[PDB]
Amino acid sequence: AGITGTWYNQLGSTFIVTAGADGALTGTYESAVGNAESRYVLTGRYDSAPATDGSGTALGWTVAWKNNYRNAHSATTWSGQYVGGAEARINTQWLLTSGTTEANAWKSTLVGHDTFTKVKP
Amino acid sequence: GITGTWYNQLGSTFIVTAGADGALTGTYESAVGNAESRYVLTGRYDSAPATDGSGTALGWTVAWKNNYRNAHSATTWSGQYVGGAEARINTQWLLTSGTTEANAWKSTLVGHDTFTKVKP
């Protein structure tokens, strides 16, 4: 699949993931420093039999921002595709949702985007 | 069809005019509707939509500044008008705050809303 490996964004945040034969994504997402307090469980899914017409490989994953050290009471999902090539890339859109009161639920979810490669910046 | 007075489920209300050449112009106010609550709305719509049952694509922006207050933010609504006896505008929105560069990653909220011509 090409997805299994260690990926980095431009800030050096890094996830290490296995793309299983069953369509599962499993791994760890950590900060550029990578200390234990910075590490979170990542789980997701990907298309294990993509098209053979030049299309990317659809995928998504979630991180809940809780570990034993700290808890932001929020979770992010990334939706995107893996793009194979001489230098592989994963391009994503993300949604970051906080736990809020009902009165604040309208402002619970941020949107953004990010891209990852296998090259450490 | 689009021109008129619209409400969401909380009673926030905009007046909008769908101009001859694709303009949307109006005012969005709160359920209380006091002066401090009124903001200018401007946008665009498809003035010649498909005739096959498709809705009419549109969008508009409100910057949350008026003569009384300023939230340093602006919202865009992207959606479609669906006509008929119970006309509706269904939208997705993005609300962006002015932020420092350090906080830009958390500048933009996403959400949704639907408007009708009936007061709740």
Partner: peptide, 12 residues
């Protein structure tokens, strides 16, 4: 919450 330590993980 959206604490500042999350920024890098989101590309910012």
């Amino acid at each position: 919450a959206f604490p500042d330590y999350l920024a890098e993980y989101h590309g910012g």
